[PDB]
């Protein structure tokens, strides 16, 4: 049984090698079956009818897995008709028997495994929302399926809560010479354009549209299949960078498609024998028909719809829809070819490009801001699997995924990131209209002049890797010279904090217990974490107590607070702002700070910039303006405001 | 001796706490404003 017809119009990789194994494999469904094959040539209705009828003389309980190579549309329909008035289930594989036809007669049995237009639209909406573009137009032309295309697009848009902006629906159908086309082309002003036409119609529309200027450096066209052919036969007037989706042929070879078809037929036969214990034949006659009415004996219709193979499942449904098609997304190459980015395998796209390459259309403020999390200034939060997004206001800063062992070379995984500086950055973006490429830096810490090389933040600023490095930077003499800093916006300094919860007297470093590293009696503390402002300032100003407490630095700040609570020494020379926030927002406000914020040197914080960057004056203007308009007070009252600040 | 929160924006109430936890009851007619 089961016969396969071919003939190698282009791919002559066949002969008897194609008729190899098949149902034997490891399948436990043996019976009087074979793997009979046949070769042919270019198809004409008389020749095709005669050949299939002749094969019906022996294919008594068999089927056909025919495939073609041309682009004649009627081939699928003729196959459907033959399947209808012969009762022999068949499938389609390549080219001609690959474009899915809309409706089939119920008294028919064949299922080509292409992909529905609605599936294409769903995948396209998924990729568009993944890049967060939302606003788009729907220019099209008159062609069959355009109406259902439009209606399905609208209904899918409306039935979700992500908020697509629907506008500029254009359905020009009056040739391409009158003023209606001109005004319709002029009216659209968005950056995302979705087209739907038929081959030469699309190329003519694009040739008209390029003369208007909608084909600049910030526009997209996501044409659905249509102008894709079956090769790299793109028209010469197709400029570049055309986003498209199509059926896969490079990750799926015909040598495996035939195997899958054979397995599906065998599994269906096994299911029929397990449910009916007998499979009849229909080898009466091809010609001389209209001699018998319907006979529902062993129809394959209920025996295929939920059939898997070797674990892999590709069960169909109703029409030729295979539920799980292997759609692939491609882009136009610079050398007029098709790329391969992402593959629709699961409901997730699994794309390859983190950002868009900005393809040259025909033959500017987005920058890379670099910062890391620290203090109540930048806060790291994990992404939310439920209703996948970064909550409501957190921005997607993409950390360099860190691992252990030799596999530490991770990718750039997304994260939800906020803090006390992200709001300032976003309001500056509002007033300046500059985008971002924020990503976490993991190479060190804030940075210091160690071995004449800066690691983390400022190092990028001195190594052409971060034009801006906003965050929790501290203004210093050596850092400002090498990194273009800004006017301070908050007051910061050095403060001494004591856990004396178990009057200020001496405030500062003018005492016999702090200035003198020796004498006194009890073991005191000068805990200062490395790579920071406190240690550098201490060693620059008074390099005497640092040597006494060189082997006393805590690992971080949480363990520092733990050691402060766990009484071994009650002293910490830290930042005035961080210590004040911690004391204000402490558990019961137990530990306190010596003095009324007598900072050793109130230098404050600064905003990083590149050397000679063209934005410093505007940055200062915006900073002073926002200092004027009583809003950073609101920011401080929202984030750094304590609970015991008013309490005495 | 009574220091109950005066207004939702009270820093004791606005900032998260652990003594008593706010109750919305069935998550309806209030959850809409809370998500708002």
XYZ file of C-alpha atoms in Angstrom:
684
model
C 0.000 0.000 0.000
C 0.766 3.730 0.460
C 2.236 5.033 -2.807
C 4.322 8.194 -3.199
C 4.639 10.103 -6.471
C 7.531 12.383 -7.446
C 9.726 12.909 -10.507
C 12.422 15.398 -9.547
C 11.740 18.497 -11.600
C 14.599 20.240 -9.765
C 15.886 18.062 -6.895
C 17.031 14.819 -8.535
C 18.085 13.547 -5.094
C 15.771 10.543 -5.230
C 15.889 7.372 -7.375
C 15.483 4.142 -5.383
C 17.171 5.826 -2.404
C 13.867 7.510 -1.543
C 12.127 4.107 -1.341
C 14.076 3.145 1.775
C 12.764 1.624 5.021
C 9.848 3.669 6.328
C 7.152 1.750 8.200
C 9.594 -0.971 9.295
C 11.847 1.277 11.432
C 10.879 0.408 15.000
C 7.131 0.733 14.386
C 4.970 -2.008 15.856
C 2.260 -1.827 13.181
C 3.135 -4.493 10.595
C 0.784 -5.771 7.905
C 0.625 -6.369 4.138
C 2.025 -2.947 3.244
C 4.905 -1.675 1.122
C 6.568 1.662 0.356
C 5.775 1.743 -3.367
C 7.009 4.921 -5.054
C 6.629 6.536 -8.462
C 8.275 9.258 -10.540
C 6.603 11.691 -12.922
C 7.087 14.998 -14.760
C 5.347 18.371 -15.036
C 1.665 18.037 -14.187
C -1.284 18.616 -16.521
C -4.888 17.758 -15.598
C -5.221 14.913 -18.105
C -1.837 13.417 -17.229
C -2.364 13.872 -13.488
C -5.843 12.328 -13.587
C -4.632 9.369 -15.636
C -1.635 8.749 -13.381
C -3.643 8.870 -10.154
C -6.331 6.634 -11.662
C -3.691 4.111 -12.745
C -2.221 4.147 -9.246
C -5.751 3.482 -7.973
C -5.602 0.062 -9.654
C -3.277 -1.260 -6.939
C -3.551 1.259 -4.089
C -6.516 -0.662 -2.708
C -6.167 0.380 0.947
C -3.396 2.869 0.215
C -2.865 6.613 0.004
C -0.694 9.149 -1.781
C 1.781 11.626 -0.304
C 2.150 13.580 -3.560
C 4.348 16.645 -3.743
C 5.030 19.235 -6.420
C 7.580 21.943 -7.177
C 5.872 24.569 -9.382
C 3.656 27.508 -8.383
C 0.434 26.720 -10.270
C -2.345 27.423 -7.781
C -4.927 25.019 -9.216
C -2.793 21.971 -8.351
C -4.070 21.924 -4.774
C -7.669 22.283 -5.930
C -7.363 19.442 -8.442
C -5.820 17.292 -5.722
C -8.788 18.166 -3.508
C -11.235 17.127 -6.220
C -9.474 13.796 -6.781
C -9.408 13.117 -3.046
C -13.101 13.976 -2.922
C -14.368 11.577 -5.558
C -11.978 8.724 -4.797
C -12.041 8.251 -0.977
C -8.245 8.099 -0.702
C -6.664 10.357 1.952
C -3.646 12.276 0.666
C -1.280 15.026 1.809
C 0.700 17.836 0.224
C 4.321 18.677 0.837
C 6.249 21.008 -1.457
C 5.400 24.078 -3.502
C 2.170 23.734 -5.446
C 0.540 21.484 -2.866
C 1.669 23.825 -0.090
C -0.492 26.966 -0.361
C -3.472 26.260 1.881
C -6.883 26.730 0.282
C -9.617 28.284 2.387
C -12.546 25.851 2.339
C -12.859 22.171 1.466
C -15.914 20.073 0.745
C -16.872 17.887 3.735
C -16.928 14.745 1.556
C -13.179 15.054 1.070
C -10.043 13.841 2.814
C -6.712 15.584 2.404
C -4.696 17.851 4.700
C -1.804 19.893 3.370
C 0.402 21.064 6.235
C 0.911 24.719 5.337
C -0.144 27.537 7.654
C -3.306 29.617 7.859
C -3.195 33.347 7.159
C -4.661 33.931 10.618
C -1.680 32.104 12.117
C 0.634 34.439 10.200
C -1.231 37.481 11.505
C -1.072 36.168 15.076
C 2.683 35.571 14.879
C 3.170 39.014 13.342
C 1.172 40.693 16.094
C 3.248 38.766 18.639
C 6.540 39.971 17.176
C 5.260 43.536 16.797
C 4.150 43.753 20.429
C 7.405 42.108 21.519
C 9.243 45.149 20.141
C 6.552 47.441 21.619
C 5.456 49.384 18.540
C 1.659 49.101 18.859
C 0.728 52.012 16.580
C 0.435 50.848 12.978
C -1.521 51.209 9.742
C -3.098 48.578 7.497
C -2.652 49.739 3.906
C -3.733 47.000 1.500
C -5.266 46.381 -1.927
C -8.182 44.419 -3.375
C -7.435 40.680 -3.395
C -9.236 37.535 -2.174
C -9.034 37.080 1.576
C -8.353 40.767 2.235
C -11.695 41.249 4.001
C -11.306 38.299 6.363
C -7.687 39.364 6.881
C -8.817 42.823 7.997
C -11.645 41.519 10.181
C -9.440 38.950 11.917
C -6.767 41.591 12.502
C -9.325 43.939 14.053
C -10.893 41.269 16.265
C -7.514 40.014 17.482
C -6.487 43.606 18.211
C -9.607 44.314 20.257
C -9.629 41.063 22.270
C -6.729 41.725 24.646
C -5.512 44.310 27.154
C -2.207 45.651 25.838
C -3.719 48.638 24.040
C -2.957 48.658 20.320
C -3.486 51.994 18.568
C -5.657 51.249 15.526
C -5.759 53.960 12.866
C -5.057 54.638 9.190
C -6.817 51.729 7.500
C -6.183 52.089 3.760
C -7.811 49.797 1.200
C -7.058 51.515 -2.111
C -8.817 49.701 -4.964
C -8.936 52.277 -7.770
C -5.783 51.499 -9.766
C -2.730 53.620 -8.925
C -3.150 56.910 -10.806
C -5.870 59.035 -9.160
C -5.642 61.419 -6.205
C -7.167 58.923 -3.752
C -3.944 56.905 -3.737
C -1.909 60.090 -3.274
C -3.948 61.382 -0.331
C -4.093 57.926 1.263
C -0.303 57.644 1.030
C 0.184 61.160 2.393
C -2.212 60.709 5.317
C -0.234 57.973 7.087
C 2.491 59.227 9.418
C 3.305 56.253 11.678
C 6.527 54.229 11.660
C 4.992 50.726 11.477
C 3.314 49.914 8.159
C 1.551 46.614 7.470
C 0.861 45.799 3.815
C -0.987 42.974 2.072
C -0.902 42.631 -1.716
C -0.206 40.134 -4.507
C 3.350 40.074 -5.866
C 3.567 42.790 -8.526
C 0.902 44.838 -6.747
C 3.122 45.055 -3.662
C 6.203 45.998 -5.680
C 4.289 48.713 -7.549
C 2.917 50.052 -4.257
C 6.418 50.148 -2.760
C 7.809 51.854 -5.872
C 5.128 54.525 -5.501
C 5.684 54.856 -1.746
C 9.465 55.304 -1.941
C 8.946 58.530 -3.904
C 6.912 59.914 -0.984
C 9.630 59.280 1.612
C 7.876 56.739 3.851
C 10.868 54.448 3.150
C 13.284 56.272 5.457
C 15.519 54.876 8.175
C 12.742 54.502 10.793
C 9.990 52.583 8.996
C 8.983 48.929 8.790
C 7.089 46.724 6.348
C 5.849 43.345 7.567
C 4.282 42.027 4.323
C 2.654 38.589 4.910
C 4.349 35.958 2.750
C 2.903 37.113 -0.587
C 6.152 38.570 -1.953
C 8.369 35.715 -0.827
C 8.343 33.147 -3.648
C 10.237 29.956 -2.877
C 13.782 31.306 -3.308
C 15.845 34.509 -3.226
C 13.943 36.001 -6.177
C 13.202 39.326 -4.489
C 12.429 42.116 -6.985
C 15.235 44.586 -7.573
C 13.085 47.548 -6.460
C 12.547 45.994 -3.033
C 14.848 48.397 -1.151
C 16.019 46.326 1.851
C 15.083 45.291 5.363
C 11.628 43.866 4.643
C 10.304 41.918 7.624
C 8.503 38.723 6.670
C 7.418 35.290 7.863
C 7.208 32.087 5.841
C 7.214 28.306 5.993
C 10.506 26.648 6.894
C 12.502 24.628 4.365
C 16.092 24.756 5.695
C 15.416 23.302 9.150
C 13.077 20.760 7.504
C 14.088 18.622 4.525
C 11.850 16.608 2.226
C 13.703 13.444 3.259
C 12.185 13.968 6.712
C 8.802 15.181 5.446
C 8.303 11.926 3.547
C 9.281 9.963 6.664
C 6.781 11.928 8.745
C 4.044 11.262 6.198
C 4.794 7.537 6.116
C 4.703 7.446 9.904
C 1.401 9.316 10.009
C -0.185 6.880 7.564
C 1.109 3.876 9.512
C -0.041 5.297 12.852
C -3.481 6.021 11.409
C -3.681 2.438 10.150
C -2.639 1.170 13.586
C -5.327 3.286 15.262
C -7.958 2.053 12.800
C -7.008 -1.574 13.439
C -7.030 -0.928 17.191
C -10.527 0.582 16.921
C -12.097 -1.335 14.008
C -9.916 -4.492 13.719
C -10.345 -4.439 9.923
C -9.333 -2.083 7.117
C -11.228 -2.513 3.821
C -10.166 -1.373 0.352
C -11.600 0.914 -2.326
C -9.948 -0.440 -5.494
C -13.184 -0.899 -7.452
C -12.404 1.508 -10.303
C -11.245 5.054 -10.951
C -13.114 5.426 -14.238
C -16.694 4.271 -14.668
C -17.703 6.127 -11.506
C -21.190 7.249 -10.407
C -22.036 3.592 -9.774
C -22.245 3.591 -5.960
C -23.432 5.948 -3.191
C -21.596 6.879 0.004
C -20.128 4.098 2.151
C -18.688 5.164 5.567
C -16.675 2.058 6.425
C -13.131 3.034 7.469
C -12.971 6.784 6.891
C -9.627 8.214 8.000
C -11.310 11.390 9.301
C -11.471 10.302 12.988
C -8.150 8.410 12.882
C -5.713 11.229 12.076
C -6.849 14.366 13.918
C -4.947 13.461 17.118
C -2.016 11.422 15.799
C 1.576 11.892 16.972
C 4.773 10.164 15.859
C 7.863 9.089 17.823
C 6.940 11.558 20.548
C 6.699 14.467 18.118
C 3.086 15.544 17.576
C 1.784 17.320 14.475
C -1.931 16.530 14.667
C -4.179 18.491 12.308
C -7.614 20.039 12.838
C -10.604 20.565 10.528
C -8.833 22.176 7.574
C -5.153 21.696 6.758
C -4.140 23.551 9.911
C -1.469 21.596 11.788
C -1.780 23.449 15.130
C 2.036 23.447 15.415
C 3.577 24.703 12.163
C 7.279 25.476 11.896
C 6.966 29.086 10.777
C 10.199 31.074 10.458
C 10.761 34.843 10.420
C 13.210 36.339 7.916
C 14.529 39.786 6.997
C 15.951 41.148 3.759
C 19.753 41.099 3.717
C 22.111 43.844 2.581
C 23.219 41.580 -0.293
C 19.579 41.015 -1.360
C 19.023 37.732 0.466
C 16.879 36.382 3.298
C 18.212 36.156 6.850
C 16.963 33.740 9.529
C 16.088 35.329 12.882
C 13.881 33.499 15.362
C 11.730 30.410 14.864
C 8.098 29.896 15.878
C 8.611 26.588 17.694
C 6.589 27.082 20.879
C 4.184 29.908 21.681
C 7.358 31.901 22.388
C 9.151 33.474 19.441
C 12.744 32.806 20.589
C 14.306 35.617 18.572
C 18.048 36.097 18.064
C 18.422 39.901 17.936
C 18.393 41.817 21.213
C 18.004 45.105 19.305
C 17.173 45.943 15.737
C 20.150 46.242 13.355
C 18.691 49.373 11.665
C 18.915 48.057 8.120
C 19.842 50.592 5.446
C 16.573 51.338 3.658
C 17.792 52.132 0.141
C 21.098 51.786 -1.678
C 19.342 59.491 16.291
C 19.352 60.094 20.047
C 19.323 56.519 21.400
C 22.361 55.985 23.640
C 23.777 53.391 26.040
C 23.324 54.393 29.686
C 25.283 52.134 32.051
C 24.581 51.733 35.764
C 24.496 49.108 38.503
C 22.290 48.634 41.548
C 23.224 50.057 44.950
C 21.492 51.686 47.921
C 17.958 53.171 47.675
C 19.201 54.770 44.440
C 19.041 51.887 41.946
C 17.065 48.749 42.835
C 17.131 45.417 40.985
C 13.897 43.434 40.668
C 13.210 40.169 38.884
C 10.879 40.038 35.893
C 7.299 38.918 36.498
C 6.255 35.693 34.707
C 2.592 36.487 35.416
C 1.331 38.975 32.812
C 4.815 39.112 31.345
C 6.110 42.688 31.640
C 8.097 44.906 34.004
C 5.213 45.546 36.403
C 3.878 48.961 35.372
C 6.696 51.511 35.774
C 9.975 49.583 36.104
C 12.174 49.810 33.012
C 13.840 46.791 31.293
C 17.534 47.082 32.106
C 19.177 43.948 30.703
C 21.822 42.417 32.949
C 24.693 40.390 31.537
C 23.538 36.958 32.705
C 26.110 35.715 35.219
C 26.865 32.029 35.784
C 29.583 29.941 37.436
C 32.185 27.422 36.226
C 33.456 27.923 32.657
C 29.942 28.736 31.359
C 29.933 32.265 32.822
C 29.633 33.645 29.257
C 25.911 34.217 29.609
C 23.588 36.219 27.389
C 21.927 39.577 28.145
C 18.863 38.625 30.197
C 16.210 41.240 30.943
C 15.336 42.542 34.404
C 12.966 45.053 35.989
C 14.985 47.941 37.380
C 14.088 51.087 39.332
C 15.450 53.246 42.130
C 16.002 56.880 43.039
C 17.880 57.706 39.813
C 15.632 56.021 37.234
C 12.885 58.587 37.839
C 15.381 61.417 37.314
C 16.600 59.735 34.131
C 13.061 59.329 32.798
C 12.065 62.926 33.580
C 15.263 64.086 31.872
C 14.210 61.921 28.926
C 10.800 63.604 28.987
C 12.422 67.047 28.856
C 15.127 66.068 26.326
C 13.532 63.195 24.357
C 16.440 60.748 24.394
C 16.031 56.968 24.420
C 18.118 54.441 26.355
C 19.940 51.111 26.173
C 20.319 50.600 29.913
C 22.117 47.394 30.880
C 23.667 46.276 34.155
C 27.443 46.509 34.504
C 29.076 43.513 36.223
C 32.839 44.035 36.169
C 33.561 45.461 39.621
C 32.081 48.355 41.583
C 31.668 52.139 41.408
C 35.342 52.540 40.522
C 38.660 53.845 41.825
C 42.166 54.732 40.654
C 43.745 51.335 41.313
C 46.684 50.284 39.108
C 45.891 53.205 36.759
C 42.688 51.537 35.535
C 39.052 52.167 36.477
C 36.759 49.144 36.833
C 33.000 49.576 36.563
C 30.997 52.687 35.643
C 33.632 55.393 35.189
C 35.993 52.957 33.476
C 33.508 52.599 30.638
C 33.356 56.403 30.525
C 37.148 56.402 30.118
C 37.086 53.435 27.704
C 34.386 54.480 25.198
C 31.753 52.110 26.596
C 29.362 54.486 28.416
C 28.669 58.039 27.265
C 26.535 58.496 30.396
C 26.966 56.603 33.671
C 24.247 58.114 35.858
C 23.559 56.549 39.244
C 25.007 56.962 42.746
C 28.244 58.660 41.697
C 30.195 60.763 44.198
C 31.942 63.949 43.082
C 35.706 63.937 43.646
C 38.703 65.850 42.321
C 40.287 62.995 40.361
C 36.994 61.630 39.004
C 35.718 64.988 37.733
C 38.882 65.626 35.711
C 38.654 62.309 33.845
C 34.830 62.001 33.774
C 32.722 65.035 32.874
C 30.559 65.381 35.982
C 27.641 67.687 36.822
C 26.406 70.144 39.455
C 25.398 68.344 42.681
C 21.711 67.598 43.142
C 21.829 65.967 46.600
C 24.007 66.571 49.647
C 26.334 63.723 50.607
C 29.376 63.382 52.836
C 30.956 61.296 55.602
C 29.041 60.543 58.801
C 29.730 58.354 61.832
C 26.929 55.975 62.827
C 26.775 54.087 66.130
C 24.413 51.348 67.327
C 23.970 52.937 70.756
C 20.375 51.816 71.313
C 21.365 49.641 74.294
C 22.888 64.920 73.082
C 25.797 64.452 70.669
C 28.952 65.591 72.531
C 31.716 65.071 69.953
C 30.743 65.285 66.276
C 33.340 64.717 63.575
C 36.942 63.543 63.686
C 38.181 65.939 66.402
C 38.526 63.522 69.311
C 41.123 61.464 71.162
C 39.443 58.168 70.186
C 39.135 58.795 66.421
C 42.065 61.014 65.413
C 44.581 58.922 67.371
C 44.757 55.366 65.953
C 46.344 54.161 69.221
C 45.838 54.504 72.991
C 42.257 54.660 74.362
C 41.279 51.111 75.480
C 38.197 49.456 73.893
C 38.431 48.108 70.331
C 36.605 50.638 68.160
C 35.712 50.468 64.455
C 36.520 52.325 61.239
C 34.622 50.040 58.871
C 34.897 51.317 55.301
C 34.156 49.033 52.350
C 36.777 49.167 49.560
C 36.238 50.886 46.209
C 34.322 53.784 47.706
C 34.389 57.461 48.576
C 34.883 57.026 52.332
C 38.189 55.136 52.188
C 39.634 57.359 49.454
C 38.640 60.534 51.309
C 40.062 59.225 54.594
C 43.383 58.239 53.030
C 43.593 61.522 51.095
C 42.839 63.725 54.120
C 43.915 61.824 57.269
C 45.884 58.684 56.287
C 46.381 57.599 59.909
C 43.317 55.622 61.028
C 43.096 53.653 57.763
C 46.155 51.536 58.584
C 44.779 50.780 62.058
C 41.524 49.397 60.602
C 42.819 48.168 57.240
C 41.747 44.599 58.091
C 38.307 45.673 59.311
C 36.252 46.369 56.167
C 32.938 44.535 56.044
C 31.891 42.535 52.992
C 28.914 44.715 52.080
C 26.407 47.011 53.765
C 23.845 44.431 54.945
C 26.542 42.383 56.670
C 27.937 45.710 57.887
C 24.582 46.476 59.516
C 24.506 42.933 60.926
C 27.929 43.423 62.527
C 26.783 46.821 63.805
C 23.795 45.172 65.493
C 25.779 42.117 66.641
C 27.887 43.982 69.173
C 31.604 43.696 68.493
C 32.204 47.355 67.597
C 29.674 50.187 67.182
C 31.086 52.533 64.536
C 30.657 53.112 60.795
C 32.080 55.978 58.732
C 29.706 55.903 55.763
C 27.831 58.226 53.410
C 25.644 60.822 55.106
C 22.711 60.232 52.742
C 22.730 56.427 52.982
C 23.208 56.476 56.758
C 20.454 59.070 57.196
C 18.054 57.004 55.082
C 18.914 53.845 57.033
C 18.429 55.576 60.391
C 15.142 57.096 59.244
C 13.865 53.779 57.850
C 15.293 51.441 60.499
C 13.439 48.743 62.423
C 12.340 50.853 65.379
C 15.052 53.427 64.558
C 17.408 51.956 67.150
C 20.896 52.719 65.835
C 21.638 56.406 65.256
C 24.320 58.753 63.920
C 26.670 60.907 65.981
C 25.983 64.614 65.580
C 23.333 66.452 63.583
C 24.681 65.325 60.228
C 28.083 67.010 60.624
C 29.451 65.830 57.291
C 33.239 65.768 57.033
C 33.070 67.287 53.534
C 29.686 67.935 51.908
C 30.526 67.242 48.258
C 27.268 65.643 47.135
C 26.608 63.500 44.087
C 27.300 64.044 40.408
C 26.057 62.940 37.004
C 28.549 61.344 34.631
C 29.086 62.283 30.993
C 31.594 61.663 28.230
C 34.603 63.924 27.743
C 33.472 66.805 25.557
C 29.953 65.433 25.171
C 27.507 67.837 23.471
C 24.912 67.652 26.276
C 26.593 68.965 29.453
C 25.193 72.505 29.286
C 21.681 71.239 28.550
C 21.999 68.706 31.381
C 22.952 71.491 33.795
C 20.115 73.699 32.532
C 17.555 70.934 33.060
C 18.978 70.082 36.491
C 18.814 73.683 37.700
C 15.320 74.110 36.249
C 14.082 71.027 38.098
C 15.824 72.301 41.223
C 13.675 75.393 40.780
C 10.323 73.694 40.228
C 9.842 72.100 43.655
C 9.769 68.504 42.389
C 12.955 66.890 43.700
C 11.516 67.648 47.134
C 8.572 65.463 46.104
C 10.988 62.781 44.899
C 12.862 62.814 48.215
C 9.610 62.747 50.198
C 8.491 59.765 48.108
C 11.662 57.652 48.240
C 14.126 58.661 50.963
C 11.626 60.015 53.506
C 11.922 58.242 56.851
C 9.363 57.238 59.457
C 11.249 58.592 62.483
C 12.466 61.768 60.754
C 9.716 63.772 62.454
C 9.831 61.574 65.563
C 12.161 62.654 68.364
C -1.975 56.497 73.665
C -3.801 56.225 70.327
C -1.567 56.791 67.284
C -3.797 55.368 64.568
C -2.956 56.239 60.970
C -4.461 59.541 59.800
C -4.862 59.182 56.048
C -3.589 56.393 53.807
C -0.450 58.408 52.970
C 0.666 58.050 56.599
C 4.323 56.920 56.456
C 3.658 54.109 58.934
C 0.809 52.918 56.697
C 2.157 54.060 53.314
C 5.463 52.283 53.857
C 5.072 48.508 54.328
C 4.806 47.195 57.883
C 4.432 43.841 59.638
C 2.286 44.443 62.748
C -1.139 44.421 61.076
C -1.868 43.761 57.409
C -4.450 45.556 55.284
C -7.582 43.625 54.314
C -9.619 44.184 51.151
C -12.234 41.396 51.548
C -12.969 39.298 48.421
C -10.791 41.549 46.191
C -13.580 43.511 44.526
C -14.760 47.153 44.368
C -11.441 48.066 46.007
C -8.975 46.027 43.936
C -10.000 48.123 40.923
C -8.830 51.333 42.599
C -5.739 49.612 43.998
C -4.706 48.505 40.500
C -5.631 51.981 39.240
